[PDB]
Amino acid sequence: MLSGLNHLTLAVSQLAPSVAFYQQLLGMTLHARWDSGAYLSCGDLWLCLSLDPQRRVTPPEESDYTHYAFSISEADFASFAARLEAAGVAVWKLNRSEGASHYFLDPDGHKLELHVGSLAQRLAACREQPYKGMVFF
């Protein structure tokens, strides 16, 4: 069967600023780069940045809710979010509808998130403050 995400590939319009964002600003590990892409890791996540002439820099009001959340500890969350804010990283959402999260944009408008907590923790929180019509299996 399927077991886990093998990799996440993000199309990027300009490779160098995107590599810098994920490696320098977000602290991911850069393993390789080439004329048309880069491979990074974030813990056990394999991230590929793929230079794509079709990628457009997309304002958040023009894209749907598809988004990518990265895990961060409760101890590190607030200072990392504040550092992104002070660095001028654009945002896309403010209301915490799914727990402790910070919503921010990459250089091409990919919708990213810092989140504290696992799926198990989110299900437990939802039992007390469920979403409308929620059923648990």
Ligand X SMILES: CCOC(=O)c1cn[nH]c1C(F)(F)F
Point out the annotated binding site for Mn(2+): 7, 67, 113
CA distance 35 to 50: 10
CA distance 32 to 134: 43
One character per residue 22-61, x = contact with Mn ion (rule: CB under 5 A): ----------------------------------------
For residue 30, which phi and psi values (nearest 5 degrees)?
-85, 120
Structure tokens at 15: 């490779």
Three-state DSSP at 26 gives coil
- DSSP 8-class letter at 131: P
Select from 7, 9, 14, 24 the one that contacts ligand X (CB under 6 A).
24
Binders of its own copies in range 108-137 (CB under 8 A):
110, 113-115, 117-119, 122-123, 126, 130-137
Contacting residues toward its own copies, per CB under 8 A: 1-11, 26-28, 30-37, 39, 41-46, 50, 52, 54-56, 63-73, 76, 80, 110, 113-115, 117-119, 122-123, 126, 130-137
